Amino acid sequence: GSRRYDSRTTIFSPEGRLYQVEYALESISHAGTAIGIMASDGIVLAAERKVTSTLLEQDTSTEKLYKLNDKIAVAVAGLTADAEILINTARIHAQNYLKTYNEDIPVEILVRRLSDIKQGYTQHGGLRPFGVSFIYAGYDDRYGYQLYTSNPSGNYTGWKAISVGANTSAAQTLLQMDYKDDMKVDDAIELALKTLSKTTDSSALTYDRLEFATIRKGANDGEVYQKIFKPQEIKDILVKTGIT
Amino acid sequence: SDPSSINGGIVVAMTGKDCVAIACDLRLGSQSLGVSNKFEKIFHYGHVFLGITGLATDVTTLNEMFRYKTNLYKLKEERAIEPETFTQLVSSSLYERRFGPYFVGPVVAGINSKSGKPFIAGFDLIGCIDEAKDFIVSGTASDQLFGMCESLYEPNLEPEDLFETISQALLNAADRDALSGWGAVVYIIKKDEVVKRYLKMRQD
Amino acid sequence: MDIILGIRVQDSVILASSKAVTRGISVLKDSDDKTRQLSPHTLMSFAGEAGDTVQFAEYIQANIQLYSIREDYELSPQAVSSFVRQELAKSIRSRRPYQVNVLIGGYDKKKNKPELYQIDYLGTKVELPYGAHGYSGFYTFSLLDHHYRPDMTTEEGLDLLKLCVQELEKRMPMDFKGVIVKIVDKDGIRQVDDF
Amino acid sequence: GYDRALSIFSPDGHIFQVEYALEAVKRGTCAVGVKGKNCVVLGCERRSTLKLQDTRITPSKVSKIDSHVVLSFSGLNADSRILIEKARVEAQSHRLTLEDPVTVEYLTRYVAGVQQRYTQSGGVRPFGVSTLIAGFDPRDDEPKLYQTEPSGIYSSWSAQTIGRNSKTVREFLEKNYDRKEPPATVEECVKLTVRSLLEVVQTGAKNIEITVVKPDSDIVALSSEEINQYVTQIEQEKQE
Amino acid sequence: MTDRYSFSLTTFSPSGKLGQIDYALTAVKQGVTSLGIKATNGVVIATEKKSSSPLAMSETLSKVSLLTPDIGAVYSGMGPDYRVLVDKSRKVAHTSYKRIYGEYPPTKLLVSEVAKIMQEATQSGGVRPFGVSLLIAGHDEFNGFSLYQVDPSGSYFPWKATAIGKGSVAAKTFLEKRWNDELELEDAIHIALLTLKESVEGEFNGDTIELAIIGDENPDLLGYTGIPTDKGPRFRKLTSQEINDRLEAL
Amino acid sequence: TTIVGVKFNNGVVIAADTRSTQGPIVADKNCAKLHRISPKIWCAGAGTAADTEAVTQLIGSNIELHSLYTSREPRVVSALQMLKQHLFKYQGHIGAYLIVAGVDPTGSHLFSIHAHGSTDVGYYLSLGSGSLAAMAVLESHWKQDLTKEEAIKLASDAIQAGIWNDLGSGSNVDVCVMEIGKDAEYLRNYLTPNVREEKQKSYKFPRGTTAVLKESIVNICDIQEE
């Protein structure tokens, strides 16, 4: 109630709902929008950039998008500072598993382990929760293309499409409204660009404000090919979709 | 028998014009018992190729090891593995077991992607970084192979010429080795693409 | 004892594993089969030194089971055999090695493929048409090279096996006291009617 | 107050963090266990009202600890992930060292031991999950039902409910079940668990999840159409 | 004043933005105006130095320290945090790249390793953020001339142009007007002097102004001539006299 | 292995042969043995080859660290000290035995360092297995206050006595002259006895002598996104 107690993870709020976790939501939402749409013929990851300065080189930074391995890519939203520990561990853990069984990591595994460190910091150690949400885009042959989200609390839920960070509600109202159930991969790109232009300050959705990647099962002979699009290929496709 | 020569195997590499070759035989034996006619040991990380001779379990170990380390390289630095950096990387690991060294003979072959510069380098048990660009040999029957490679090889070989030369070098040593004889594979590695040729040769 | 055999046929993986347990110069037991069921589709037989045999076999069993349950997904046989190779590649560099030769048969349910991996003591894993371990294996490698054809049915796989068995008993002064032969196939693991 | 300490024993005799755990159990899904003579029926809510959710890869609330040991839970999903993992490892540990398959009763204790340990060790929160661990003892075909609490202790009841609107469910369990006689038939037993869950779900095919666990490693989760069949039959009675 | 949560670095702040991290920025501002301009064929970094006591020697106060012979750094902030951070940068780099890959880091990799150190003085409770924000300007072969900022948080960003300190506002706008990357390096040095000259006009003498370039190799300063293939030092620090020459070109 | 060190008035000159052997087989026709601790501190290595490279790399860094830390070129003796302790610990299993040479602001030096941990100073030193041969020239001709010019002849001639008597000594002689106040003048391939000669007869094979059983083309190249 009055005396808000939250110094440590171990110390409970009267409410029972740890305030440090509450503050984590605020932070996630501070960062701009990122969006994952899972399609039957690829996954599409499309986001508006955090940065906005033209002096600062927006172009070479794919702050949102880092690949952890050949099949798995993650979109990142929250605290940059904290985040940097977790992205790095995740890559090494993936390569540790490939060492052991000499197979790509299952998507489900890789999330559940990372979520469990996030819990670890509330379960024991005064150490703050590392308040970060990733959208995981991965492929395994257990379930095909898989998409996950992770809560700062340290739990995960699968999704057909999800939005993270800022203005989650608005992007969410649009996606569900015009949702096409099957989802074609071409379609997902179009649909994504429409949602971002409405939530993005520039309504012409400049290329220099855009990060884009497409992971495709629609890549020759039925295989998974990750392709990071540069700012120059974003620009060419911007004129294809016609917002500019 | 020291653990390396239980499993022997051979690797022979040569540079040619705008290309490298890395080639090996396919016989896997443990002592008197030959175990598999067909068995590979040349792997590639990007455009950089590494064959590895010696004790078989340690081959498998190191291959994993390097695959792990090289993954991080291409991800963090945001550029392909080069041969030059890669030569140092193989060397660093090998030295950490000074006492009781890995019982292996690694061989790097690949082309620097920044100037087409053909690059080969070799290694022994203990991490020696051999800079011969003419040829590199490794295995038990290394000695045999050197003797072929030194007469047959000539500076400047056309790609299609280099393919014949290395093949005769590998083949005749094979039949004067015990722990080799069964089949062969040649990687001819060019900047544009890789052609991989399974040869027909005599088999015991 | 010194013999473990495996033969990978058309539509199944067949394992035969010694019944003898000889601890010195006396046969303490003539029946116990030296195998541990890792999955209903994966069988591991084992041989080597006293003490190391039982600890290792059961330690491996536990790990595969734990894996199996955690995700509710039966790991590929390909993965299982890699698992074992690593644990051994560690052992041999460690304070105390584990000297156990194993044949890992699994029938990949999904790719409807039999797969037999020969992992000798070192931690040299190879996938072969057919394999064995120990000195015993030499004798039999000829009958398998000649008479094997891919088109051998499961049933024809049994027949060749009996002929190998007979030769092994003749020229080894030590009889391994017959074999319990079990079939790892899409049905699962079953024990041959006779043996 | 004393919510900032665990070491401090408190003259209230009640450390607030412990009280707060209970608030957390309440919030979670309702999870119910009702046992026959030959079965444990576990009826539980799994929410699925979430828009754009691919249901296939979303974890079912029930998690196989062992081959014949199951767990349902009420309370925070994140905190609950630690119990499931410790308990799985220990499962396989048991077989590795005793050979004996998992004694359920050991396992009940092992789990509670962890929620206890952390009450004594400062700088480690007590978990705000209560669980149901249910199973069948080695060499036995009598159903076994346990609940654990975040007070770091355990108890056995003939049937028990935990999570949101448990008050409502408890009246049902008193009047339709009895300790003296559990419903002898499996069938009887399943139909009552569906009626209990309906009181708080208020109509849902996938919002209701039924897993029946029988002896000798028999785990099967009831078919959506069969669940639907329990509902319609019950719903005819409601207007009579 | 602020919360006991925000002073703590083991405790999520209400806002989620530490008070701490914000203190580190207040201090950066309080320091010198340091800048970096990226050119086709070079990078120029330039700064003014503290006048300090009259009889304190100015030379010994060094605000540009070479990390490697081919990559220099510039900072705004306090001396003590600067030196300790600087020994850590070189040391961690030797281990992770001069023995492994037996060569000097890419600029990107070195920048990555500097962020990590930073990050740890913010993660661990009771250890304040580095009191300093860097520019790491450098040259490596693979990715050419490169220009960076590394924040005491442990986030880093490449730029076309950035400036830090009190006069950051002023400077950045001036660079924009007068220059773009495609312009040559020679022009930028004259420009950078003028920019820094707004900052202070009492003295602009080459004694109090430390100006350096990372550009072309100097095969003279390789120091073991007779082998040409090894890159010379990319960095060359320009003497006071040299500054004065560059002042009459303005 | 023949390595020499000769002080001269205004510096020091270090030389060693390029030929490398692994056993009785010649591994490398040329590969210099002269390694760089720093620009004006060079050493040439004998012993176990692997150890000599490794120790130079590890120590190298600390010396580089020193240099920058102190904003001053380390002493020749500083390298000497740091090198000595390392070897001493393992009681010489790490088997690098080195001639440490250099010039610094203090002056010119020439020392030897052994794996056991013993040191000496010499006006003129020799190391390797060809130490015996090289020295003999040195001791018969050397006078006090040789010129730079004269040091360089005496030196090279001495390596020749190694070459001809020690099998492992051979090919090009490489020289690094470090002089006070100047960038070391690495005289690459100062001396050349003879080199590889082309075989009398050609060993060019008409195509189709190799037989090709099967072929599978590998694409390390980027599969289309399309």
Structure description:
Chain A has helices spanning 19-28, 80-101, 107-123, 168-177, 185-199, 231-241, and strands at 34-39, 42-48, 65-67, 73-78, 132-140, 144-150, 156-158, 161-164, 210-219, 223-229. With 244 residues, chain A is α+β, with helices and mostly antiparallel strands. In chain A, strand 1 (34-39) and strand 2 (42-48) form a beta hairpin. Chain A starts with 18 loop residues before the first helix and ends with a helix. Chain D has one domain: 4-Layer Sandwich (Glutamine Phosphoribosylpyrophosphate, subunit 1, domain 1), CATH 3.60.20. Chain D contains six helices and ten strands, in the order αββββααββββααββα. Chain D has helices at residues 16-27, 77-98, 104-120, 166-176, 186-201, 224-238, and strands spanning 31-35, 40-45, 63-64, 70-75, 129-136, 143-148, 154-155, 159-162, 208-214, 218-221. In chain D, a hairpin with a 6-residue loop joins strand 5 and strand 6 (143-148). By secondary structure, chain E is α+β, with helices and mostly antiparallel strands. In chain E, helix 3 (79-97) crosses helix 4. Chain E is globular. The interface between A and D is large, with 42 and 32 residues. Strand 11 (194-199) of chain B pairs antiparallel with strand 13 (212-218) of chain F, so a sheet runs across the interface. It is classed as hydrolase. The entry lists the keywords Macromolecular complex, 26S proteasome, Protease. The entry is titled "26S proteasome in presence of BeFx (s4)". Chain A: Proteasome subunit alpha type-3.
Summarize the structure.
The structure is cut from a larger assembly and holds chains A (244 residues), B (204 residues), C (195 residues), D (240 residues), E (250 residues) and F (226 residues). With 244 residues, chain A is α+β, with helices and mostly antiparallel strands. Chain A is built from six helices and ten strands.
The major pleated sheet of chain E works out as:
5 strands, antiparallel
**Helix- and strand-based class of chain E?**
alpha+beta
* Fraction of residues in β-strands of chain A: 25-35%
What is the tally of beta strands of chain E? 10
Largest interface, Cβ cutoff 8 Å: A-D, 42 and 32 residues
Secondary-structure-based class of chain A equals alpha+beta
CATH class of chain E: Alpha Beta
Question: Which features would summarize this protein structure in a list?
Answer:
part of a larger assembly; 6 chains; B: 204 residues; alpha+beta; Glutamine Phosphoribosylpyrophosphate, subunit 1, domain 1; five-stranded antiparallel β-sheet; 5 helices; F: 226 residues; 13 strands; globular; isopeptide bond (chain A); Ntn_hydrolases_N (chain A)
Which secondary structure elements does this structure contain, and how are they paired or packed?
This is part of a larger assembly, with chains A (244 residues), B (204 residues), C (195 residues), D (240 residues), E (250 residues) and F (226 residues).
Chain A: H1 19-28, E1 34-39, E2 42-48, E3 65-67, E4 73-78, H2 80-101, H3 107-123, E5 132-140, E6 144-150, E7 156-158, E8 161-164, H4 168-177, H5 185-199, E9 210-219, E10 223-229, H6 231-241
Antiparallel strand pairs in A: 1-2, 1-8, 2-9, 3-4, 4-5, 5-6, 6-7, 9-10
Helix pairs in contact in A: 4-5
Chain E: H1 4-7, H2 19-30, E1 34-38, E2 43-48, E3 64-68, E4 71-77, H3 79-97, H4 107-123, E5 132-139, E6 145-150, E7 156-158, E8 161-164, H5 168-178, H6 185-199, E9 209-214, E10 235-238, H7 240-247
Antiparallel strand pairs in E: 1-2, 1-8, 2-9, 3-4, 4-5, 5-6, 6-7, 9-10
Helix pairs in contact in E: 3-4, 5-6
Chain F: E1 2-8, E2 11-17, E3 20-22, E4 25-28, E5 34-38, E6 41-47, H1 49-70, H2 76-89, E7 96-103, E8 108-113, E9 119-121, E10 124-128, H3 131-141, H4 148-165, E11 173-179, E12 185-191, E13 212-218
